[PDB]
Design a protein around this ligand. Structure first.
Ligand SMILES: *[C@@](C)(CO)[C@](*)(O)[C@H](Cc1ccccc1)NC(=O)[C@H](Cc1ccc(OC)cc1)NC(=O)[C@@H](C)NC(=O)C1=CC2=CCC=CC2=C1C
Ligand SMILES: [Mg+2]
Ligand SMILES: [Mg+2]
Lengths: 231, 233, 240, 211, 222, 244, 195, 235
């Protein structure tokens, strides 16, 4: 009300409204799902178009051979944060000959987003990210919020109507975690999960976007007729 | 640009079937003066890596601190710091190599020659060299300074190529290293009798031996040598 | 440094500071530009509220940017000096790096770019000035006349006016100026420029300034008596 | 190297050799010492090969940007000046670059000499490199404004040959160019080994040499 | 006074075929009169069917290769996983080298691969960035020993057809990969005999439309 | 943050005016009147000190008339402290010009420079403008005797006769009436004092409430002399013209 | 470059400047004009290190042309010479000084007098009736000391200048390829096409 | 007052949303992509008859293979065009090749959100970026001040955008020829424009693989306008 003019102002109940408004931009964004087993980690994203003449906005971005994310909210902010991850992943390789741990990648994103929430002049990031990766401690899935909060999960979903997919994964927890050495079945579970967030529209060939990473599988994105198999 | 003041001489090393060995004497020379006699030039990093350093001692102490700080920093927000995400020899080496090459590119080098010896997660042996120029290389045997000229020839008789590594035992490799250190004591004017030796094995882990001495030396034949040509008495 | 964003969008999609800069131009004295077949003429109003003025030393309304290009304006006088200085520096800078004098189009594009920069830079306000830039390109006999404004947009004009009561003199020019056959001579071009100002000026004494620019760096400013003869001839024909 | 370029009635000729040296060692037999900046602009190279390639390709970037901003091709005079100004920024920093900017613009054919000192000279005829003295000898005694395209191409070709023969750091092959108002025209790569024997027989020159 | 440069010896060799290319180099690393390693790889697969070797001062050579490999990675990120053509890679490397015009990478660089028409390509550089596409190039310590041999046996220089007596040249027939590898092995065997910095081992990287293949051959260790 | 407390000194009103410049001019209108009159053989500068005291040391006091160099002087109307900042800058600029070209600075060039500084404070920096209006009286070999004025907007204009400060409307009317082109310095002195005597808000115009100065070619042969009048000299010229 | 001469007569200033330009052992050009018009009645000739000369001259030219446009007024030769001196005096203590010597010939329209200023690369200014830079003065000043009068005509000034060039051509080892002569007077600047 | 980079309660940046309102006031620009090329057309909209219409430059060349049309505060586009031209030629310097249309568009869109308290406000102009490359063929992009860019088969921006976009919805198909696209742009421009469409107040352009980016002459466009009138009168 009087305490939402900038990011440097607490409300009387201890809330940061500019951060909460940035969080709102994520809810307006299109749905994206993340889930993993012990061997592989999968991203599934519902892409959004402007109209029938327009293309479908890309949702998934590659960060390294072993790491990448999906976005929901302001796309340009995701480009900034993914670029930062690309640099950090790359700094780890060039200096230490070491693939960046997914957990440490989350810590770096948290700290970058935090600086924007405590200083005058700037603004919080208006995007949520789901980071997947495979490192020395196996498969991983992270959820990033622009408040700074990063959380490691078995599965999750963000965006509009994301609660439906999140409930499904909460039921299926014991099943999909055990899908080891079977990428196609893990993707099936992700496609079935994101389907719980759909209304009116359904999954078409240029609508669906999938990405996967695993033990002997580099981070690769599937679009177009490559995802027709899973429709 | 500087000049080295207090210096440490040769560091020698080799691979064997289950790991690596590295050794270096305990002397800190001040030109021709054998000033400091209790200097440790082998510095362990965790229980899987030993960094051996020759050259300027003040720059060595600086590197020693960088490595100590590296271990501290790797443990930050890392539940697997004593397991999967522990520091590897390859990580430690590449860090140092990055530092050495950056410093030479600013014309303010760390006046050292470094050998990083260790065993990786998968049990593979690691042995790589780096120096003040940022020059790096790997070989079954590695040595700095005088050791390059006198020790390598002896160690290459045991492991002449890669295929000789599985055939070489730890007893044979340690014996060869100890003999090489004796030869250096005979012939290197900036060397000492006292030295340290480290073994990193993929089964038995890190064994760090201190206060070793060169023994079984041959001097008796000196009594018979008289004059510089014609003198008989 | 002072970084405050003064020029910003409003809910209806307007930048008020840029629009209020146009109001400063509306307040400024009237300036007019007319291009003939082989010349361009720049006319300027001088408000007669200020008498006891020393016309020798008072800053003239038309300014030479180079030997072949001139610039007149309407709006804040102090603001115009900054644009003129920058323009003059760029003109010499272009000769120094490219070995050719600026084209009229290039000089206009530079001045317009400066004006635009001051609409999306922190800690600064827009120039309260619109300019008429006229001249002839090197080794070219085709006349050039451009207009700029605070927002930074520019365009070429057969004839144009800016400043106070510019709506009236533009109305006059729109019906009197024929594109198929423009003022063939210097006389016809000046006469049309004086006629257009007489719709607004008040008295035709020291209130009208005229500057004729011809090809090959031939620029001259008319005197009071020379202009007064045009004023006399126009009204004598009007009495009929 | 030996490079030359001269203006004449039917435009401008540009001829260069193709040798590169690293001491007494011939590091390259066939190097390109002409750069096609645009279809009406050429640039010769003499000095540090790296400097010549980098700065003349950076000139082409800047000449291309000129066309986009102004909707018109850059003049030879302006192009040469941009290059001379680049040289003045790295004044005394150790660059080694001698070049001729050849082309056709509104003023007709244009030719400017530019070097690492920032020197910029307009003229009808220039020759740079370790063998320029040998080339000047042939050019000065045979040049006319009234030269035919066929005779002019041969002159530049024959002038490089003269230098390639005597100068130890010039040779390999001859690259010919002819600039017209429709643009430049490449007139081929000519091996000096073969060209020498051919010219010797047909012209009767190089009598001292046995073949 | 501190000398930031050094010489690690070695020699490299690039030859372009009709539909293939090779990039070879010895595996010996040296300082002065000592041997550092008998097997220290010098020619690398940089991705996108491109191979590269920077010969001279190993520290600068490793940094350049490392930087180019990085440039390839960022080219994929920035331009939708587009393949970096050999000509585009060459131009990119020129700018990496000239970034240090006043503190040079002390290396002679060579890359090899296939052009966009599927034909074999070799590009050669000097330490400060001048580059050019070539058919044949030897670089490094024994470059002056090998290049004349290649002029003779690859481009058939000074060779004429018998009976004509210097009137008709030997025609420029292309070489097969098997014939090229022979010239490479004989080049390095000869260089090993007469140059002290050359020896120990030989590693050849062959590039075809099918990918990058390796071949290793021993050399004299004296 | 800090934005909350920013007055925004460099913005346009909806009507296209600069708020702070207009309010600065309002400040200046309450300042003591200063008059400048240009004649064929010299220039006069006259100015009124504001409600003085008997205990003010007049002979060592200077609030209105300042010397920029040997050829140029200024009369001040507004905040004296603001004026001194600008005056010292102008003094430096004149010396920079003399050092560079080895010639005394032309009057207009000095005036333009000061006016450009004032302009800057209205367009950028977020600071308040200088609440000062100058009358420049000067001489050079190009245009001869010159009068200029500048105000907080940074706009400057040339004049034959002009007033700044209080009652300029009334003062300008009186000057416009009695001024003629063939006028001389001695006549201009009389006009300046008569105009102040009629426009003044004080009961009577006296020597202790005035500062006066002339720039004359009335110096031995082809050269110019600046005369800052002393208290006793102002008293004498008041008796001579028949005011006291 | 090599030789630049100057002489101030009754009603004009005459500047003579060599035409040669040399790189290495080769004379690249024999028609080079070592001068720039600073204003309609002010001409500056120059000589010094390669490249620096033209860059400096064009930089000065731009600054004076900028002044002329701003004030709609031509600076006096004295004012221009002082501006140039300061730029050179500023330059000599820079990281890399501009190694340029100049002569400034101008006609003062106010005083109706010709004026010649000699300024070296250090910023050493002197007003003279005749001047030169480098070794040129060693050969020519003896002739000028003998023959010069202040009431000389332009034609007499050219004849005395021819004698100076002939002496240079006889006793100098270097071939400077003749001179381009320019005259500065009340009517402006013109070139003597036959010399 | 309030921050320039402030979020609204709905989760949108106020200034970005307000700049979109400025773009709605701008003159109409239309783009249509086909397999034979991409066509770009604009409404000039001269404020007075004395204004020489040929000086209105709302269609612009970025490279030989990339063109651009604009709508909104057109003065803001000049720095964007300058950056685009620099980016296109710089990539040619570094990589000896043409730059991808998408990569060029991304470089322009990176400038968009570089505003705060960098420039003081977002751009008040939208761009239609049309071009061709070997990888993805003929392409049309819509670059906004939000930093977002969508690829389009056909797109209209400016004051008559929603009406024109609805018309483009029905008319566009994947087998359109270049000539058909030209007439289609002219048809829709004529529909949404206030004044009567002619060669002086409307401009056409196209980009083909062979000839590259070309702005159409007024004589060439005039014939296409006459060809349009006759085919509409044909039924
Ligand atoms: C004459 C041959 C003079 O020697 C020419 O001037 C020639 C000009 C030139 C050649 C190629 C491309 C453009 C222009 N210049 C040289 O060959 C030049 C001579 C030289 C050497 C050193 C300096 O430093 C003061 C200046 C000029 N040589 C080189 O630049 C040398 C360093 N180039 C190479 O050695 C070289 C090796 C090589 C391998 C593969 C591709 C390119 C290579 C080059 C340029
Ligand atoms: Mg040996
Ligand atoms: Mg001197």
């Amino acid at each position: 009300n009087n305490y939402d003019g900038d990011t440097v102002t607490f409300s009387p109940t201890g809330r940061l409204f500019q951060v909460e408004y940035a969080l709102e931009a994520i809810k307006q964004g299109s749905v994206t799902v993340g889930l993993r087993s012990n061997t592989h980690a999968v991203l599934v994203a519902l892409k959004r178009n402007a109209d029938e003449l327009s293309s479908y906005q890309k949702k998934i971005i590659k960060c390294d051979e072993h790491m990448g994310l999906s976005l929901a909210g302001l796309a340009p902010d995701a480009r900034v944060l993914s670029n930062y991850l690309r640099q950090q992943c790359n700094y780890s390789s060039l200096v230490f000959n070491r693939k960046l741990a997914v957990e440490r990648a989350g810590h770096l994103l948290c700290d970058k987003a935090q600086k924007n929430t405590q200083s005058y002049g700037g603004r919080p990031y208006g995007v949520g990210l789901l980071i997947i990766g495979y490192d020395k401690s196996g498969a991983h899935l992270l959820e990033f919020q622009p408040s700074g909060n990063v959380t490691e999960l078995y599965g999750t979903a963000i965006g509009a109507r994301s609660q439906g997919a999140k409930t499904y994964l909460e039921r299926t927890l014991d099943t999909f975690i055990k899908i080891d050495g079977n990428p196609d079945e893990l993707i099936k579970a992700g496609v079935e999960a994101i389907s719980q967030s759909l209304r009116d529209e359904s999954l078409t060939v240029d609508n669906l976007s999938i990405a996967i990473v695993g033990k002997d599988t580099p981070f690769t994105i599937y679009d177009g007729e490559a995802v027709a198999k899973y429709i | 640009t500087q000049q080295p003041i207090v210096t440490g001489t040769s560091v020698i090393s080799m691979k064997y079937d289950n790991g690596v060995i590295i050794a270096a004497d305990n002397l800190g020379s001040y030109g021709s003066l054998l000033r400091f006699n209790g200097v440790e030039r082998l510095i362990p990093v965790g229980d899987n890596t030993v960094v051996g350093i020759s050259g300027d001692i003040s720059d060595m102490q600086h590197i020693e601190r960088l490595l100590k700080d590296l271990v501290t920093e790797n443990a930050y927000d890392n539940p697997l710091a004593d397991a999967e995400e522990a520091l590897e020899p390859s990580y430690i080496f590449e860090y140092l190599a990055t530092v050495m090459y950056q410093r030479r590119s600013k014309m303010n080098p760390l006046w050292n020659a470094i050998i990083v010896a260790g065993v990786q997660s998968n049990g593979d042996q690691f042995l790589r060299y780096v120096n003040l120029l940022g020059v790096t290389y790997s070989s079954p045997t590695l040595a700095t300074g005088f050791g390059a000229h006198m020790a390598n020839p002896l160690l290459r008789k045991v492991v002449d190529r890669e295929s000789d590594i599985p055939k070489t035992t730890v007893q044979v490799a340690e014996e060869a290293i100890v003999n090489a250190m004796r030869v250096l004591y005979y012939r290197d004017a900036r060397s000492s009798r006292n030295f340290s030796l480290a073994i990193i094995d993929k089964n038995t882990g890190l064994t760090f031996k201190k206060n070793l001495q060169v023994e079984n030396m041959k001097w008796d034949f000196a009594k018979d040598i008289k004059g510089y040509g014609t003198q008989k008495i | 440094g002072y970084d405050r964003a003064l020029s910003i969008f409003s809910p209806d999609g307007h930048i008020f500071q840029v629009e209020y800069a146009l109001e400063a131009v509306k307040r400024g004295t009237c300036a007019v530009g007319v291009k003939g077949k082989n010349c361009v003429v720049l006319g300027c109003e001088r408000r007669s509220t200020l008498k006891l003025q020393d016309t020798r030393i008072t800053p003239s309304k038309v300014s030479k940017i180079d030997s072949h290009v001139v610039l007149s304006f309407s709006g804040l006088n102090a603001d115009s000096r900054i644009l003129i200085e920058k323009a003059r520096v760029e003109a010499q800078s272009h000769r120094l790096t490219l070995e050719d004098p600026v084209t009229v189009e290039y000089l206009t594009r530079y001045v317009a770019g400066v004006q635009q920069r001051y609409t999306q830079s922190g800690g600064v306000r827009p120039f309260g000035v619109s300019t008429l830039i006229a001249g002839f390109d090197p080794r070219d006999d085709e006349p050039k006349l451009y207009q700029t404004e605070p927002s930074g947009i520019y365009s070429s004009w057969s004839a144009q006016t800016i400043g106070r009561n510019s709506k009236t003199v533009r109305e006059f020019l729109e019906k009197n100026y024929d594109r198929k056959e423009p003022p063939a001579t210097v006389e016809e071009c000046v006469k049309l420029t004086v006629r257009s100002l007489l719709e607004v000026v008040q008295t035709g004494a020291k209130n009208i300034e005229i500057t004729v620019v011809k090809p090959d760096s031939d620029i001259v400013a008319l005197s009071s008596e020379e202009i007064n003869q045009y004023v006399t001839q126009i009204e004598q024909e009007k009495q009929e | 190297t030996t490079t030359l370029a001269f203006k004449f009635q039917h435009g401008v000729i540009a001829a260069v050799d193709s040798r590169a040296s690293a001491g007494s060692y011939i590091s390259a037999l066939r190097m390109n010492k002409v750069i096609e900046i645009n279809p009406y602009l050429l640039g010769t190279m003499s000095g540090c090969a790296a400097d010549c390639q980098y700065w003349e390709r950076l000139l082409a970037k800047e000449c291309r940007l000129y066309y986009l901003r102004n909707g018109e091709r850059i003049s030879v005079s302006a192009a040469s000046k941009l290059l001379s100004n680049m040289m003045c920024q790295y004044r005394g920093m150790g660059l080694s670059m001698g070049s001729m900017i050849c082309g056709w613009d509104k003023k007709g054919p244009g030719l400017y000499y530019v070097d690492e000192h920032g020197t910029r000279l307009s003229g009808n005829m220039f020759s740079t490199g370790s063998g320029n003295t040998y080339a000047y000898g042939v050019l000065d005694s045979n040049y006319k404004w009234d030269l035919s395209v066929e005779d002019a191409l041969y002159l530049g070709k024959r002038s490089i040959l003269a230098a390639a023969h005597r100068d130890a750091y010039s040779g390999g092959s001859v690259n010919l160019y002819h600039v017209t108002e429709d643009g430049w025209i490449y007139h081929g790569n000519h091996d000096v080994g073969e060209l020498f024997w051919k010219v010797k027989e047909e012209e009767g020159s190089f009598n001292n040499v046995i073949g | 006074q501190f000398n930031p440069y050094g010489d690690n010896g070695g020699t490299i060799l690039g030859i372009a075929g009709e539909d293939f290319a090779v990039l070879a180099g010895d595996t010996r690393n040296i300082t002065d009169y000592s041997i550092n390693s008998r097997y220290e790889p010098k020619v690398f697969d940089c991705g996108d069917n491109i191979v590269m070797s920077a010969n001279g001062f190993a520290a600068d050579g490793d940094a350049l290769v490392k930087r180019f490999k990085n440039s390839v990675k960022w080219y994929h990120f920035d331009h939708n996983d587009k393949k970096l053509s050999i000509n585009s890679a060459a131009r990119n490397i020129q700018h990496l080298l000239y970034s240090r015009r006043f503190f040079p990478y002390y290396v002679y660089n060579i890359i090899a691969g296939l052009d966009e028409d599927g034909k074999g390509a070799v590009y050669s550089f000097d330490p400060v960035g001048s580059y050019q596409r070539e058919q044949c190039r030897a670089g490094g310590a024994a470059a002056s020993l090998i290049m004349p041999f290649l002029d003779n046996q690859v481009n058939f220089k000074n060779q004429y057809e018998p009976g004509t007596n210097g009137k008709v040249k030997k025609p420029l027939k292309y070489l097969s990969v098997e014939e090229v590898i022979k010239l490479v092995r004989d080049s390095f065997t000869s260089a090993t005999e007469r140059h002290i910095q050359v020896g120990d081992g030989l590693e050849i990287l062959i590039v075809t439309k099918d990918g990058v293949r390796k071949e290793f051959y021993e050399l004299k260790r004296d | 943050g800090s934005r909350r407390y920013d007055s925004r000194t460099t913005i346009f009103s909806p009507e296209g005016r600069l708020y702070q410049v207009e309010y600065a001019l309002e400040s200046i209108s309450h300042a003591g009147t200063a008059i400048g009159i240009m004649a064929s053989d010299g220039i006069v500068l006259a100015a009124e000190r504001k409600v003085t005291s008997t205990l003010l040391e007049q002979d060592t006091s200077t609030e209105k008339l300042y010397k920029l160099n040997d050829k140029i002087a200024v009369a001040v109307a507004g905040l004296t402290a603001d004026a001194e900042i600008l005056i010292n800058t102008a003094r430096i600029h004149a010396q920079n010009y003399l050092k560079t070209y080895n010639e005394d600075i032309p009057v207009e060039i000095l005036v333009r420079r000061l006016s450009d500084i004032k302009q800057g404070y209205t367009q950028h920096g977020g600071l308040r403008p200088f609440g000062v209006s100058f009358i420049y009286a000067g001489y050079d070999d190009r245009y001869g005797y010159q009068l200029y004025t500048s105000n907080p907007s940074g706009n400057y204009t040339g004049w034959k006769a002009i007033s700044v400060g209080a009652n300029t409307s009334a003062a300008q009317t009186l000057l416009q009436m009695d001024y003629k082109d063939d006028m001389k310095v001695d006549d201009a002195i009389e006009l300046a004092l008569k105009t102040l005597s009629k426009t003044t808000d004080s009961s009577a115009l006296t020597y202790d409430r005035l500062e006066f100065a002339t720039i004359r070619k009335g110096a031995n042969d082809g050269e110019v002399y600046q005369k800052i009048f002393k208290p006793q000299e102002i008293k004498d010229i008041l008796v001579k013209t028949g005011i006291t | 470059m090599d030789i630049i001469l100057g002489i101030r007569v009754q009603d004009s200033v005459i500047l003579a400047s060599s035409k040669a330009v040399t790189r290495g052992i080769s004379v690249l050009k024999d028609s080079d004009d070592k001068t720039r018009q600073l204003s309609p009645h002010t001409l500056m000739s120059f000589a010094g290190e390669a490249g620096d000369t033209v860059q400096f001259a064009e930089y000065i030219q731009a600054n004076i042309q900028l002044y002329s446009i701003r004030e709609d007024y031509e600076l006096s030769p004295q004012a221009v010479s002082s501006f140039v001196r300061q730029e050179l005096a500023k330059s000599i203590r820079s990281r890399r000084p501009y190694q340029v010597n100049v002569l400034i010939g101008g006609y003062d329209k106010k005083k109706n007098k010709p004026e010649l200023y000699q300024i070296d690369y250090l910023g050493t200014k002197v007003e003279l009736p005749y001047g030169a830079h480098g070794y040129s003065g060693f050969y020519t000043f003896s002739l000028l000391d003998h023959h010069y009068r202040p009431d000389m005509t332009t034609e007499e000034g050219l004849d005395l200048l021819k004698l100076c060039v002939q002496e240079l051509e006889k006793r100098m080892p270097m071939d400077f390829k003749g001179v381009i002569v320019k005259i500065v007077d009340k009517d402006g600047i013109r070139q003597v096409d036959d010399f | 007052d309030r921050g320039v980079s402030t979020f609204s309660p709905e989760g949108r940046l106020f200034q970005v949303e307000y700049s979109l309102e400025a773009i709605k006031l701008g003159s109409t620009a239309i783009g249509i992509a086909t397999k034979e090329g991409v066509v770009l057309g604009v409404e000039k909209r001269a404020t007075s008859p004395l204004l020489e219409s040929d000086s209105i430059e709302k269609i612009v060349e970025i490279d030989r293979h990339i063109g651009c049309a604009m709508s909104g505060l057109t003065a803001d586009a000049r720095s964007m065009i300058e950056h685009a031209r620099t980016a296109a030629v710089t990539h040619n310097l570094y990589y000896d090749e043409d730059i991808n249309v998408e990569s060029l568009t991304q470089s322009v869109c990176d400038l968009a959100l570089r505003f705060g308290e960098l420039m003081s406000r977002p751009f008040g102009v939208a761009l239609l970026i049309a071009g061709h490359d070997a990888d993805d063929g003929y392409q049309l992009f819509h670059a906004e001040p939000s930093g977002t860019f969508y690829r389009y088969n056909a797109k209209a921006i400016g004051s008559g955008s929603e009406g024109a976009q609805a018309e483009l919805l029905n008319e566009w198909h994947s087998s359109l020829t270049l000539k058909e696209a030209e007439l289609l742009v002219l048809k829709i421009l004529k529909q949404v424009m206030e004044e009567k469409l002619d060669e002086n107040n409307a401009q056409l352009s196209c980009i083909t693989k062979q000839d590259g980016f070309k702005i159409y002459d007024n004589e060439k466009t005039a014939e296409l306008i006459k060809e349009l009138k006759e085919k509409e009168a044909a039924e």
